[PDB]
Design a protein around this nucleic acid. Structure first.
Length: 151
DNA sequence: CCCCCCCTATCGAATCCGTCTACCCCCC
């Protein structure tokens, strides 16, 4: 009962939900309990992916505004925000890189690139976890995480 | 001028290599 879930399938719905959260927590400054401390977005790419494409510019502005409001929320109100994303071209010219282009790369503070192992030991919960960007510690370290036997 | 993003199977070819023997009949 302490885990609250809301469905948003368009960027306007997500913006409205986050603005409502900001307003409610601003009104709840007096209170000391019941205020959410962790905010999780299941997929920020799926909502904004249809808005990209073409030679227009409103999609980039919308995603930048969403990033700015997320950053203001997390900084001002001391919340931990976690979002997900997808990968882009794996061809020879372009390495495995996060989606949403170059402009989104400056938004987050920490990047964790989940991956699957190949050959022996594949399948199951065996996934390789790496830290791409942290801006606080050396990067490029690979570890192992099991989910099938975890919880 | 500048932005972000992907595809799909095909044909047929080319012969080699010999083993094993059995079984007697009839008087002036």
């Amino acid at each position: 009962r302490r885990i609250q879930v809301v469905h948003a399938f368009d960027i306007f719905q997500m913006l409205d939900v986050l603005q409502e959260l900001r307003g409610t927590v601003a009104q709840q400054v007096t209170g000391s309990s019941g205020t959410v401390k962790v905010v999780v977005v299941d997929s920020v790419t799926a909502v904004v992916s249809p808005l990209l494409g073409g030679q227009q510019r409103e999609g980039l502005a919308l995603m930048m505004q969403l990033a700015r409001e997320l950053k203001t929320l997390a900084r001002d109100l001391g919340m931990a925000v976690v979002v997900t994303n997808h990968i882009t071209r794996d061809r020879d010219s372009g390495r495995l890189k996060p989606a949403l282009g170059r402009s989104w790369s400056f938004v987050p503070s920490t990047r964790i690139l989940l991956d699957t192992i190949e050959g022996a030991g594949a399948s199951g919960g065996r996934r390789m976890a790496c830290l791409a960007k942290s801006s606080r510690q050396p990067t490029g370290f690979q570890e192992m995480v099991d989910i099938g036997t975890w919880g």
